[PDB]
């Protein structure tokens, strides 16, 4: 089971439950078609069960680590949180696993629709590259999740807009001509 809302027919007001009239919850299967993948494992069962590593092999993930979010335990909160706070696009994939804490991930559909997805402990989520997304969890102001990336940590130093790069940007222009 996955927790998410189809705000496509719901009011932008965050305070509201975003329950359309009639109301309709996100379709887990619908998102999978969108290219969204999620792993259900117990953080405690993750380390005790390298099986999660097996999933990495399928997604070609050689680098993995455990990251926790906290103002006091996460120096550089303003820039770090603001950097991923804004929605951006790029040719890189997004793999996040919530070992602990509560939060939600922002995803976009090809139909130009936005869905609010809630991330729970033990629930992992993957966002295909080339799709806009926004990660937030300020509601709890304390979330612990693992991140899986391939190659050198690009996030360490990256440009907001993916198109910013001629090679990673100019290439995108070719798609427009398609
Ligand atoms: Fe991203």
């Amino acid at each position: 089971m996955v927790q998410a809302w189809y705000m496509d027919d719901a009011p932008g007001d965050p305070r509201q439950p975003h329950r359309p009239d009639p109301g309709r919850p996100v379709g887990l299967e619908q998102l999978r078609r969108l290219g969204v993948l999620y792993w259900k494992l117990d953080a405690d069962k993750y380390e005790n069960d390298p099986e999660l590593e097996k999933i990495r092999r399928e997604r070609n993930y050689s680098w993995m680590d455990i990251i926790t979010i906290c103002k006091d335990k996460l120096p550089n909160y303003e820039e770090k949180i603001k950097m991923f706070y804004e929605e951006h696009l790029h040719l890189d994939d997004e793999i996040r696993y919530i070992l602990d804490g509560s939060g939600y991930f922002d995803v976009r559909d090809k139909e130009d629709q936005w869905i609010r997805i809630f991330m729970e402990k033990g629930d992992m989520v993957t966002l295909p590259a080339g799709i806009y997304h926004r990660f937030t969890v300020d509601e709890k102001n304390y979330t612990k999740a693992m991140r899986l990336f391939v190659g050198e940590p690009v996030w360490t130093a990256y440009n907001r807009p993916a198109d910013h790069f001629e090679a990673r940007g100019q290439y995108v222009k070719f798609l427009a001509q398609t």
Side-chain angles (χ1 to χ4, degrees):
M1 296 187 73
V2 66
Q3 300 294 53
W5 225 235
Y6 218 77
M7 290 185 297
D8 187 12
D9 293 348
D13 263 310
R15 295 185 303 210
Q16 259 258 137
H18 295 165
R19 325 262 221 71
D21 171 340
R24 88 88 145 264
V26 88
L28 187 162
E29 186 184 1
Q30 296 178 345
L31 297 206
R32 187 156 67 201
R33 186 260 267 152
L34 181 74
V36 162
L37 309 171
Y38 79 133
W39 306 153
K40 301 188 296 232
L41 295 94
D42 295 345
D44 65 275
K45 296 185 185 153
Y46 119 74
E47 186 184 2
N48 80 357
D49 210 17
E51 296 183 351
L52 91 306
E53 186 184 2
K54 186 177 68 92
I55 300 168
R56 293 178 60 211
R57 188 64 128 200
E58 294 300 343
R59 304 299 182 191
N60 100 279
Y61 299 141
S62 151
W63 181 97
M64 95 172 283
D65 193 9
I66 306 175
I67 302 175
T68 306
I69 303 178
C70 355
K71 296 179 72 116
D72 62 11
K73 187 182 186 166
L74 197 103
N76 185 347
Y77 181 101
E78 185 69 25
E79 294 182 350
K80 189 182 189 97
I81 247 275
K82 74 184 295 125
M83 281 180 70
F84 65 53
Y85 256 7
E86 299 186 358
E87 35 257 346
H88 60 235
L89 186 71
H90 43 50
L91 304 186
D92 294 346
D93 65 14
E94 236 64 307
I95 308 110
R96 295 185 188 214
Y97 190 10
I98 306 312
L99 299 196
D100 189 83
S102 181
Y104 66 94
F105 190 28
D106 186 6
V107 303
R108 188 179 72 149
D109 189 5
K110 66 188 294 130
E111 189 68 24
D112 296 346
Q113 300 183 178
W114 286 102
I115 303 176
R116 71 189 305 271
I117 309 175
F118 183 86
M119 297 185 71
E120 186 184 1
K121 187 229 285 97
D123 183 353
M124 190 186 114
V125 66
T126 306
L127 179 87
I131 303 175
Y132 297 94
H133 49 274
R134 184 181 184 147
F135 185 85
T136 47
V137 305
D138 65 13
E139 296 83 6
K140 256 50 114 78
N141 198 359
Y142 185 89
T143 305
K144 187 182 186 158
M146 294 178 20
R147 300 293 186 64
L148 295 74
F149 297 101
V150 306
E152 289 34 74
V154 173
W155 198 104
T156 305
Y158 85 140
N159 297 141
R160 262 242 183 296
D163 187 82
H164 206 50
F165 291 96
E166 296 182 351
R168 298 184 189 159
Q170 187 180 351
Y171 205 97
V172 172
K173 295 185 184 80
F174 293 91
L175 302 185
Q177 291 72 72
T178 287

